[PDB]
Coordinates of C-alpha atoms (C1' of nucleotides) in Angstrom, one line a residue:
Chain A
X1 CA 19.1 -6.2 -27.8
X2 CA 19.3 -2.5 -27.3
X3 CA 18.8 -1.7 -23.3
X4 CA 16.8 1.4 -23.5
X5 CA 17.6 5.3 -22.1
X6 CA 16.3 5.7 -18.8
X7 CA 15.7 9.3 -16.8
X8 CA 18.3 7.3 -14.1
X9 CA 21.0 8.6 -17.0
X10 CA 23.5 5.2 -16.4
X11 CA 27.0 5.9 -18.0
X12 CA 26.1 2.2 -19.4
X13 CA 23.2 3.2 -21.5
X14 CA 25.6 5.0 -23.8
X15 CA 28.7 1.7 -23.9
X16 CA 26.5 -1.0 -24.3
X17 CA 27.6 -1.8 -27.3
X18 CA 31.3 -1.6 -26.4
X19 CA 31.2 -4.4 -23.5
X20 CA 35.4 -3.8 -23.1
X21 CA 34.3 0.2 -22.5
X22 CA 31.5 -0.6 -20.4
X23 CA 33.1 -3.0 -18.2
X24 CA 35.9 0.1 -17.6
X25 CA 33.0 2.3 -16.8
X26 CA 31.9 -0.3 -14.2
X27 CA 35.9 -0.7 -12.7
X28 CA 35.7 3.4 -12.7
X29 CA 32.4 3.4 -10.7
X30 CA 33.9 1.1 -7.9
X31 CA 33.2 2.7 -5.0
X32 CA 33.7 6.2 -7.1
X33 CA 31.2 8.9 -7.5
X34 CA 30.1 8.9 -11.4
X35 CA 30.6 13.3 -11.4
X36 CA 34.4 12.5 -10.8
X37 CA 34.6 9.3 -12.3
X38 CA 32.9 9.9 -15.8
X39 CA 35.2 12.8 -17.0
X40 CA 38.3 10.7 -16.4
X41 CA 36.6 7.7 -18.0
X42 CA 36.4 10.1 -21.7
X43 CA 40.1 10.8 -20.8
X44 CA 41.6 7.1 -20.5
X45 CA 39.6 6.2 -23.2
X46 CA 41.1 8.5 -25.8
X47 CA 44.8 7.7 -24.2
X48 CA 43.5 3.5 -24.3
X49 CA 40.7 3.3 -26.7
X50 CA 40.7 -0.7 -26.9
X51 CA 41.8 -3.5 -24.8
X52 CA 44.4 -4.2 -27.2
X53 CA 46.1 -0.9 -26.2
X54 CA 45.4 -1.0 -22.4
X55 CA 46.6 -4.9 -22.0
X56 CA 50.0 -3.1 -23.2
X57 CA 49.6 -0.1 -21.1
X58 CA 51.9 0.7 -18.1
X59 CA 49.9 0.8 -15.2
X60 CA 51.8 4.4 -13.6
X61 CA 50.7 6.1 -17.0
X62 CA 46.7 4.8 -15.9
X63 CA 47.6 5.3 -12.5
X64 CA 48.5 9.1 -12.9
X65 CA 44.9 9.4 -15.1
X66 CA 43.0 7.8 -11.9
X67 CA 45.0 9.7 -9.0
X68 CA 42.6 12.2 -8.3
X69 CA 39.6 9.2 -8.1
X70 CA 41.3 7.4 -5.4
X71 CA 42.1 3.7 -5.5
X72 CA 44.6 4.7 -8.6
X73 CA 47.4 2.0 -8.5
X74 CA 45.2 -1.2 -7.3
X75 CA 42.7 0.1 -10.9
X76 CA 45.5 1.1 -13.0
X77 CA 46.8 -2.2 -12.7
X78 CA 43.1 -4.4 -12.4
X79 CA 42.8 -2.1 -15.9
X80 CA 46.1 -3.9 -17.6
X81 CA 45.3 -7.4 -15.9
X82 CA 41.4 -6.8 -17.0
X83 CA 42.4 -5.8 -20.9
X84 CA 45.1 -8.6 -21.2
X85 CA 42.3 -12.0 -19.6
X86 CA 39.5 -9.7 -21.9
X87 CA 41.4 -10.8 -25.0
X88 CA 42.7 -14.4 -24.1
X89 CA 40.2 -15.7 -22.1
X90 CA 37.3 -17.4 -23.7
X91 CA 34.6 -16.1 -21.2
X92 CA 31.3 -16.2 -21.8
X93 CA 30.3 -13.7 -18.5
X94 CA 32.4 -10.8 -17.6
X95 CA 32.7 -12.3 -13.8
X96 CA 35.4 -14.8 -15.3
X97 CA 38.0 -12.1 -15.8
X98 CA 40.1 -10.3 -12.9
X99 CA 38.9 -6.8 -11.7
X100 CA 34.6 -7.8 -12.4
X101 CA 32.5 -8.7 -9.9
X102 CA 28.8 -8.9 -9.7
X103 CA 28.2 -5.5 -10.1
X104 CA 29.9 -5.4 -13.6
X105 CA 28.9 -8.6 -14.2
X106 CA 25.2 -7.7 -13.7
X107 CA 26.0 -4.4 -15.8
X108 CA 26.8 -6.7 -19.0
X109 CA 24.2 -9.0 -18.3
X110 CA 21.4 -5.8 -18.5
X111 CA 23.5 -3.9 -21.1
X112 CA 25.8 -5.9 -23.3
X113 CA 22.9 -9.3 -23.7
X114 CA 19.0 -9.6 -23.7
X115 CA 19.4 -11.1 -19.7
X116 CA 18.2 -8.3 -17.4
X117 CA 15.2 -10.6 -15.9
X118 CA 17.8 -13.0 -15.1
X119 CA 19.9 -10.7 -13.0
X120 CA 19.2 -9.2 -9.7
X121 CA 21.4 -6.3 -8.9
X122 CA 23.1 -4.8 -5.7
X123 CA 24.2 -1.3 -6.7
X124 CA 22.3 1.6 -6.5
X125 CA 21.9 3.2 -10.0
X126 CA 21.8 0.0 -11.8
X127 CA 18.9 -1.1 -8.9
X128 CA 17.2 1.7 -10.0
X129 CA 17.3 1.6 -13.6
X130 CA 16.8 -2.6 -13.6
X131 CA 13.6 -2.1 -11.3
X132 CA 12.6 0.8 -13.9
X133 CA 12.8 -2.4 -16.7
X134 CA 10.5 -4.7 -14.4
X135 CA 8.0 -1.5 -14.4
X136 CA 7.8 0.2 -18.0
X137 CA 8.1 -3.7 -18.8
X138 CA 5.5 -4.0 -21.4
Chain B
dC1 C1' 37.4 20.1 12.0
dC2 C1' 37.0 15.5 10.7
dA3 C1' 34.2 11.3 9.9
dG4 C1' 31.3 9.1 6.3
dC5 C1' 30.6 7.9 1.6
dG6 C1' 30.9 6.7 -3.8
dT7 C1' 26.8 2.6 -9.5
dG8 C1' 33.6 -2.9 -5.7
dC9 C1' 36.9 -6.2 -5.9
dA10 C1' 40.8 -9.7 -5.1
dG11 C1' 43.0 -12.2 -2.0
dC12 C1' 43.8 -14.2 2.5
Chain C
dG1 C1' 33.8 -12.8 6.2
dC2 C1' 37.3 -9.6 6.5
dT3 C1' 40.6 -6.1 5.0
dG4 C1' 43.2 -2.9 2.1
dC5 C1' 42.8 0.3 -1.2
dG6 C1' 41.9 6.0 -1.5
dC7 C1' 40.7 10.5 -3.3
dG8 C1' 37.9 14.3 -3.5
dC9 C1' 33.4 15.4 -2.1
dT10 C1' 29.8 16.9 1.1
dG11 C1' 27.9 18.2 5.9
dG12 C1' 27.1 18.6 11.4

DNA sequence: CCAGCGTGCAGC
DNA sequence: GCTGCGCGCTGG
């Protein structure tokens, strides 16, 4: 599966293959606008390029990388949590570990496996882009 | 000036 | 279903 580039421009089109980096993209879009989020996102992920390095982060080194986003210490430490259950739980859908929801989990499901007619999504952008799919279909 | 909003989510 | 978290950003 390889979710095609859409004129919407989703930060996901680009991590799909990645699904630890995309799901970050997802926690750094949570109710934070992708102009301020995106930057910072290219910033933590040279500092914590895997999960393996962010499940041993400490969260007031992410937290000073997400103060200017907002929601820094509740994210820098759903980032550790989120890194640490990536690598030990045996998930199948992203919604199993702690700090995704349904709008990650709907991210993955579009982006990460071949399941985007399956999902039905409730944030904006991704709304966008998954009823662009349903159009240019065929 | 100052309220509303951003590709939410966990926990109660 | 409600609430806390939260900044910087934009606009009457």
């Amino acid at each position: 599966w390889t979710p095609p580039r859409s004129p919407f421009n989703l930060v996901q089109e680009t991590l799909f293959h990645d699904p630890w980096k995309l799901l970050i993209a997802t926690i750094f879009l949570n109710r934070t606008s992708g102009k301020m989020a995106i930057p910072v996102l290219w910033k933590f992920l040279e500092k914590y390029p895997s999960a393996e390095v962010a499940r041993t982060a400490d969260w007031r080194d992410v937290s000073e990388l997400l103060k200017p986003l907002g929601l820094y210490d509740l994210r820098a430490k759903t980032i550790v949590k989120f890194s640490d259950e990536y690598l030990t739980k045996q998930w199948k859908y992203p919604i199993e570990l702690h700090g995704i929801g349904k709008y990650g989990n709907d991210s993955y499901r579009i982006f990460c496996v071949n399941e985007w007619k399956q999902v039905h999504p409730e944030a904006h952008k991704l709304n966008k882009y998954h009823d662009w799919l349903w159009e240019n279909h065929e």
